[PDB]
Design a protein around this ligand. Structure first.
Ligand SMILES: OC[C@H]1O[C@H](O)[C@H](O)[C@@H](O)[C@H]1O
Ligand SMILES: OC[C@H]1O[C@H](O)[C@H](O)[C@@H](O)[C@H]1O
Ligand SMILES: OC[C@H]1O[C@H](O)[C@H](O)[C@@H](O)[C@H]1O
Ligand SMILES: OC[C@H]1O[C@H](O)[C@H](O)[C@@H](O)[C@H]1O
Ligand SMILES: [Ca+2]
Ligand SMILES: [Ca+2]
Ligand SMILES: [Ca+2]
Ligand SMILES: [Ca+2]
Lengths: 121, 121, 121, 121
């Protein structure tokens, strides 16, 4: 299992120790408070009012938690994944990432605390 | 395992099929958008910019997801619980509850989708 | 999870720390060598070439591992149960027992080693 | 998980759909009756009274269930493995094999039924 923090201002995100292998079932729980610039903070689902101005993940709000598995495209995590299995032919290390516009992470703040584990399968 | 909705304006909470028994380990993941009044909506962590005016759970923000197990006091859930074990002498039906001030539920809207599962022990 | 030994000579059997509750999924793995009287020893499946002369469990061979959940009747365990749900409504402490005819346990010998845990549900 | 059968006269063994990966925890439960040549049949622990005359696994009796993980050596399975981690960092597909002397499988009969699953990690 893996337990850690994902920094909102980290454009490259956080490569965890979790290698998602074919057939794996995983569970992720994410918590905390982060900002993509404003004084205000949002949780791992991000800001439902802010427009997508070129986000690394277009299927989640600005300020949401997302991930990559190996060299996959971005996949929404939001508050977490419950006994989740990946789409075909997706595998590799899980990288966790705050959803913002590339080049605009510098004014970000806060973090999410995240637990990942493998479930029975 | 249980999957269901928890309505923000339901003061009674939502009873799930989950009976928490001594020794049980559980995982909860909660998602979605709800309001305790304002036209704006918050995820399962609630509104961190709002004061506690006599909330059912003082250990969570207003608009947060909370729970009771049998006749326990309120326990925070927020975005979820990862492989969690209850305090001794806490057991019975899990009821999920939106965190608000009692009697002020009428102006609430939205809801959270919540998965609960028992883990290996 | 529980690990312990079940003696062939114990007509009372072995209480475990596992309480089976409705909806629980369990796994048991049993190993070792025992006898209901003969010099030869058998594993937890017992002796397939021996007639049933009034065994505590008619659905398993003489010398097999069986169990009770609370005050249920006997349920075969044999070498174990993989991610098993009680097919009947039963509840309570699992007790493990060597399958022999009551009062004939005085010539029995050996024991089985047994692991039991609850699985995700 | 994988649910299948292992035939006593299959010298190569049965390749399963389970790929053991680094960090995996597995549970195996095996049942049934088989023979390495005699009339009698034995369970997945094999015959504790038969000498080792060059068995493919020296850590298990003749007629026992064993396996290989990738190009590992033979690993005893017997009645099964409870929440088990592979030693020495072995990894790869799990192949299940009846323990007998190489070239003497031709007179074998019966089978074991086997369940394999991955556990939480
Ligand atoms: O839309 C994303 C964008 O939102 C605001 O304009 C922020 O101040 C920028 O840093 C960037 O995060
Ligand atoms: O702080 C609790 C309180 O918050 C706001 O004022 C809402 O209008 C009320 O309905 C109540 O939910
Ligand atoms: O059938 C059961 C019976 O089997 C033999 O007769 C044994 O010697 C007895 O002690 C009893 O275990
Ligand atoms: O020791 C193993 C050996 O045992 C007997 O002699 C069998 O007939 C052989 O086929 C072989 O399985
Ligand atoms: Ca920004
Ligand atoms: Ca309200
Ligand atoms: Ca006896
Ligand atoms: Ca043979």
């Amino acid at each position: 299992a893996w337990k850690g923090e994902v920094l909102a201002n980290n454009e490259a995100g956080q490569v965890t120790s979790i290698i998602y292998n074919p057939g794996d079932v995983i569970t992720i729980v994410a918590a905390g408070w982060a900002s993509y610039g404003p004084t205000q903070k949002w949780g791992p689902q991000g800001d439902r009012e802010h427009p997508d101005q070129g986000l690394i993940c277009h299927d989640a709000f600005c300020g949401a938690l997302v991930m990559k598995i190996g060299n996959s495209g971005t996949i929404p995590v939001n508050t977490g994944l419950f006994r989740w299995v990946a789409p075909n032919n997706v595998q590799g290390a899980i990288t966790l990432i705050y959803n913002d516009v590339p080049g605009t992470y510098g004014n970000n703040s806060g973090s999410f605390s995240v637990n990942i584990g493998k479930d029975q399968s």
